[PDB]
C-alpha cells in the first residue's frame, strides 16, 4: 500500500520527474568520465613526450572544456526541476490535510491536542515531500558513482582493485556506526539540558510565590546541580568526538600512501603509468564517498515512510457527524418553538459523570424563559446541544415538530445565536471581528458596521483609538468593551433565536450601565433563553424553571413559586 500511495503522490509530476532523471543520468556520466581524460592528458605531457606535443594539449583541453559546459547545464536543470516538484507536492499535502482536519467533530478535538496537529501540518508534510523528490536524486547519484568506480578500477588494474576493495568498505561502515553512536550521546545530553531549562522556566514564571516563602536560594542550588550533571554528561561526547577525529584522519591519510606503495612496485605486464594511478585514486575516493552517500538515503527514506504513515490516517478518517448535509425549511415553517424530551447526556471525556437525565422543556415563540438553578451544574451544555455540537445518549431535540438530526447543521446554526460572558476575539481589526457574523463578510459596507456601533454603545470607546475601527485586537481591551463588541456581531447576524450566558461577577459601574442598555434591543422581538446567575432578570422573565439534579424539578412564573405556601 505504501508504494501505491507514493506512486499516487508522484503521479501529477511525472512529466517533470522523468526529465530530471534524464538530465541526472548525463551529468553523472560526464562526471565519472572526466578522470579517464585527465589521465590521458597527464600521460600525454609526461609519458614519453614527443618533439611537438603542444597541439594535442590544446585540442584535448578544448574538447574537455566543451564537455564540461554541457555537464553543468544538465546539473542546473536537474536541480531546478527536482526542487520544484517537492514544493508542488507539499502544497497539495498541506491543503488536503487542513481541509480534512477542519471538518471533523468536536469530540475528536476533545481527545486530541492542537500541538500534535500543528506538528503534523508543519513537519510531516515537509519530510514526506522531501523524501521522494530531493532524496531519490541523491540515492541515484550515490548508486551511479559506486558502480562505475568498481568497473573502472577492475578495467584499469585488476591487481590493485582487489587490494582496495578490502580496505575502504570496512572503514566506511565503522565510521557510520560511530557517527550514530555520537548522535545518540548528543541526544541524551540535549534531553538533560531541556529538563534543566524547563525547571528554570517554571521557577521564573512564578516569582511572587517564590519570594513569599523565602525560597530564592534553593532554586539556584538545584539549577546549579542540574548544570553540573549536564556538564558531566557532555564530557563523554567530547571524548567520543576526540576519538572519531583522531581515527578518521589517520585512516584517510594511510589509504593514499598504501595505494602509491602498492602501484609503484608493480613491474612487468602489471605496470601502471602516472595517469592510470591518478585515475585509480580518483575512482577509489568516489567509491568511498558513494558508500556514505548511500547510507543516508536509506535513513531518510525510512523517516519519510514513518511520516507518511503518520499522515495517512487523518486524511482517510471519516467524521462521525454529518457536515453540510440535510433538509431545510421555509420562513413560516419555524416559529421558534424548541422542545426537549427525555434527553440523556454525558461528556465523552468523562462518561462517568452524567449531566442530563429525563430532560423535558418547551419554549414557545416569543417567550423569555430563564433556567435559574444551582451554580456549577453545567447547565451551559444546553447551548452545545441546540447547535448540534454533540448528541444525546437517548432522547429527541425537535424544533417545530422536527428532530434536529434531520435538519442541515449549517442552516440551523444561522438561526440560533449566542452571547458569551468572555467573547473570544481573533487577531484582526475591530471591523473584521464585527463582519464575521454576516453571510458574506467580504461584501460588507462600512455603512452597516457604523450603524451597529451606536446601537451597541461601542462608538464611544472606539473613537479614542487612534486608528478608529482598524485597531487590531487579540491591542488590549477591557472586559466591558469585549461584551459590547460581541453584541455588534449578534446585531449584524440578525438571529431568530437567542441563547444568552450571563456573567456571575458584576462588571464595573460604567460597564454595568452601558452593557445593560445594549442588551435591551438584543432581547427585543425574538425567542430568548436566559441562563442567569443572579435574580436581577428573574422577575422580568415571562417564565422561570429550576434545574435540580439534572432535571426540571419545578416550573412556574416568578410569582407562582414565590406565592406558594413553602416560601
Ligand atoms: C574510508 C572512508 C573515510 C571517511 C568517511 C573519513 C572521514 C574523515 N576524513 C578526514 C580527512 C581526510 N580524508 C581523506 C581521504 C578520504 N576521504 C574518504 O572519504 C576516502 C574513502 C579517502 C581515501 C581514499 C584524507 C587524505 C584526509 C586528510 C586531509 C586532512 O588533513 O584533513 C577527516 C577530517 C580530519 C581532520 O582534519 O580532523 C574526517 C572526519 N576518512 C576516511 O578515510
Ligand atoms: C586521492 C583522493 C581520494 C584523496 C582524497 C582527497 C580529497 C578527495 C579529500 C581531501 C580532504 C577530504 C575531506 C576532509 C574531511 C571531510 C569531513 C568529513 O566529515 C567528511 C569527509 C571529508 C569531506 C573529506 C572528504 C575527502 C576529502 C575532500
Numbering used by the authors: 155 to 628, 632 to 724
Reproduce, without paraphrasing, sentences from the article in which this PDB structure was first reported.
ABCB10, a member of ABC transporter superfamily that locates in the inner membrane of mitochondria, plays crucial roles in hemoglobin synthesis, antioxidative stress and stabilization of the iron transporter mitoferrin-1. Each monomer contains two parts, the transmembrane domains (TMDs) and the nucleotide binding domains (NBDs).
ABCB10-BV exhibits inverted V-shape homodimer and inward-facing conformation as well. The ABCB10 full transporter binds two BV molecules simultaneously. Each BV molecule is sandwiched at the interface of two protomers. Indeed, the interactions between BV and ABCB10 can be divided into two parts: The hydrophobic interaction with one protomer and the hydrogen bond interaction with the other. BV contacts with residues on TMH4 (V322, V325, S326 and A329), TMH5 (F398, F399, T402, S405, N407, I409, and V410) and TMH6 (F439 and I443) hydrophobically. Two residues from the opposing protomer, namely S185 on TMH1 and N229 on TMH2, form hydrogen bonds with two carboxyl groups of BV. During the model building process, we unexpectedly noticed that two cholesterol molecules are sandwiched between two BVs.
